[PDB]
Every structure is written in C-alpha cells, then in structure tokens.
Amino acid sequence: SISPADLLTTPVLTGVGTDNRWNGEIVGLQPVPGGFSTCNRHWNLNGSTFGWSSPRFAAIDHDRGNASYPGSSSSNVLELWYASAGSAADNPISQIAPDGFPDMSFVPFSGTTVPTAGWVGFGGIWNSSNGAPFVTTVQAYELGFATGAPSNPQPTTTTSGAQIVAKSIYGVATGINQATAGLFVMASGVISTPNSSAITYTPQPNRIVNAPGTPAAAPIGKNTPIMFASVVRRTGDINAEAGSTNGTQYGAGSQPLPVTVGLSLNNYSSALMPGQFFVWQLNFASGFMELGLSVDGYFYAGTGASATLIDLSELVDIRPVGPRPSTSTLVYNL
C-alpha cells in the first residue's frame, strides 16, 4: 500500500491488462536487447510523463491543421491533414501533440499505395467553422510524426521541429481543401499492411517518437528492457485475431495500461530508490521469471541478448518479491 507491489497483479498479464500504445490484451513479453525509449502514455515513478497523452484511449482532436487532396477531381482521393508539433494549445499535459496522437513516425505513401507498419485510426476531417464533420472524408487514416510535409513527408523520431500528419490510407468519398480544418480520429489504433501477411512487432524501436528529456531504456548487465506484446488488428487482414491461420500480428507498448494508470495517480519516489528495481515473480505452469520496474517506468527481464518473444499463455500468477539492485540479474527460469 506504500510499495509499488499493487501495480502489477495477476490479471494485468493474464488477459485483462492491455498495453499503453494499442490498448490490446497483453499476451507476451518482448525483450529489446538493442534498447528503446518511450514517453507517450508512459509514466515514471515520480508522477511524471514526458509525453502528451493521458492514460486512457478516447479520441484525438486538433482544431487547426491544413487539409488537402491532390488533383482536379475530388472523388476517391487520399486526404492529407497536417499541423506543427507544439501546436496542441488545448492539451493540458503537453502542447507537443493532441492527447492520444500516436508516438510513431509517419510512413509516407501516395497514389494507390497502402503504407506498411503505420498506426491507423478511424475518423476524418471536421469543419473549423462549426465543429461538424466533413462527412465525405471519413476513412482509415495513418497518423504519425514527420518532417517535410506536405510535399515530401519523411519519418522523424524527435518531436522538436516535427509535424503531426494524418493521411487516409484509402480514398475518401470526396476530398476537402481547407487551409484551416480539424482532425478527429478514435485513439484505438490498428496496423497498416498492404497484404494479408503479419509483419514484425509494431512499432520497432526506431519508429518510436520521443520528446526531449525522455530517458532511454538500455540493458543493465544481463537485465534487458521489455515491451508488452498484444494482438493488434492489421488492415490487410482485418478479421485476423489470435490463432489466425494468416499469422499473428503483435503490437507493443512500454507499459501495461493498468500500471500507467496507477503511476499517474500516485508517487512512488519514497518507495523505490534510483538504481533499484521493484521485482515481481511471474509463475508459469512450468518455471518462473522475474520482472523488474525501474524508477523511469521501464520494465526489465533477465534475458540478456535474447530477442525472443515470451508467451504468457501459461502464466498462472504474479507475486511481489520486493526492491532489488538493478545490477542484480533478474531470474529467468523458463
């Protein structure tokens, strides 16, 4: 009750807990031997986030971007919306981007190409004059951070000097050209794919967008940072779920959302010292492993150089162990 123990209970990793990027049911642990950073909808143990999102999945809303489509015919066109990072004046957490905007770099596309590994959400453009949707622009949109929009958007992984971009991955019924227009997109995303095949866990570390000051997660001895893997829909085979014959698609997040929520409500600085992990034991049908939580809010496992996904289907229960030195190897007994 004064310790971090209650942040991670059995249900968080055995079917109830979802990840803090995709809001998908967590079903695996993904080690990241090469390290990574994440700030959006990520909290530390001192009540702080470096991102721009609250620990929830609602809607993405920005009232002042540029909306356009190419060419002289407005039917069945790709709709583009973009604004500058730092323009989210109505966001009380951070003005970097609208609450819920995904922390992934923009994958550009044009013509008839559907992008690969884009964060995609449903919604459209809306009318800055009155708040009404431009009903002919509803579609699935890729959202991400870029530089060089509108003519040549390219991915960027820093928010400084960035643009926030939304582009319909399929043709909207009728395009809209308005220099000032709003964006509205539901905050629960899917992964864009051009065919039926699953791709690697998404986002890969080098696709994650981070704000200045975001601490990095790197290996500490044999302890390696992890992401939490969930089953996420993909556009090329939207019906595919866990156990699909077309392959399983994973999305990854830096924290279980229940942990993020708990961290956002509390301050755990008096409970865990810098350089300590809080450790839990994960008990499987056969064997167990330890997970450690750092003061920066990253989770670790004692898996060393391994990049192999750990399946949680046989996870039985979680028990708190207590604070440990981060230099002490987390047990891996699977």
Ligand X SMILES: CC(=O)N[C@@H]1[C@@H](O)[C@H](O[C@@H]2O[C@H](CO)[C@H](O)[C@H](O)[C@H]2O[C@@H]2O[C@@H](C)[C@@H](O)[C@@H](O)[C@@H]2O)[C@@H](CO)O[C@@H]1O
Residue 99, binding choice from its own copies, Cl ion, ligand X, none, Cβ under 5 to 8 Å by partner class: Cl ion
170 part of the interface to its own copies, by CB under 8 A: yes
Burial of 299 (0-12, 13-18, 19+ CB in 10 A): buried
Residue 129, binding choice from Cl ion, ligand X, its own copies, none, Cβ under 5 to 8 Å by partner class: ligand X
CB of 197 to ligand X, least distance (A): 10
Tracing tokens 């390290």 back to the chain, one arrives at 35
Q: Which stretch binds ligand X (CB under 6 A): 36-44, 239-247, 269-277, 307-315?
A: 239-247
Residue at 101: amino acid letter = F
180 part of the interface to ligand X, by CB under 6 A: no
Go through 238-276 and write b for each residue having 16 or more CB atoms within 10 A of its CB, e for each that does not.
eebeeeeeeebbbbbbbbbbbbbbbbeebebeebbeeeb
Residue 37, binding choice from ligand X, its own copies, Cl ion, none, Cβ under 5 to 8 Å by partner class: none
> CA-CA distance, 296 to 43, in Å (whole number)?
8
| Residues from 209 through 248 that contact its own copies (CB under 8 A) | 233, 235-241, 246
Q: Which stretch binds Cl ion (CB under 5 A): 117-125, 162-170, 188-196, 223-231?
A: 162-170
> CA-CA distance, 329 to 316, in Å (whole number)?
23
Question: In sequence order, what are the beta bridge partners of 290?
Answer: 281
Question: In sequence order, what are the beta bridge partners of 311?
Answer: 28
Which is closer to Cl ion, CB of 10 or CB of 66?
66
Q: What residues line the site for its own copies (CB under 8 A)?
A: 11, 16, 18, 23-25, 55-59, 61, 63, 75-76, 122-123, 126, 130-133, 135-136, 138-140, 170-174, 182, 184, 186, 188, 196, 233, 235-241, 246, 261, 265
